[PDB]
Design a protein around this ligand. Sequence first.
Ligand SMILES: [Zn+2]
Ligand SMILES: [Zn+2]
Lengths: 94, 65
Amino acid sequence: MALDGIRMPDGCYADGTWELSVHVTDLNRDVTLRVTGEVHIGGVMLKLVEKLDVKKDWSDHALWWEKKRTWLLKTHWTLDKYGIQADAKLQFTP
Amino acid sequence: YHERRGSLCSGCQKPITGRCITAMAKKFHPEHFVCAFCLKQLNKGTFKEQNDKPYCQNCFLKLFC
Ligand SMILES: [Zn+2]
Ligand SMILES: [Zn+2]
């Protein structure tokens, strides 16, 4: 709806889409993927690569959470599950 | 001028000397028919796909499971 307990700019935004930041360490760039708190990690590496479109290092691709120094390989859980969001900047490296 | 042949990779039409994948009866360079995650190797026995993009199951499953 919109209420959600807040209002709309924050109680809606438009659809609850927040692009997750991705600091590519293998490129040193920073990309953002328009996602929601329901996309599986394996869902992010897919899109980010889709934008690439090249026989580049695709297997050497995996997201890590420096706020946790982890390796986001839990395709079962999601962002919300762990608590990730736009305030969480991930990276795209092996 | 040896004689060791193999199997032309349909689409490439060049003998496949080593490993050879088979399709609708066509052959394929085990490489030119890899998974699009880790483009190094795929197998018609474990070749998964989505949106037309090849994938190893372990690769595709990792995406949508
Ligand atoms: Zn070929
Ligand atoms: Zn693969």
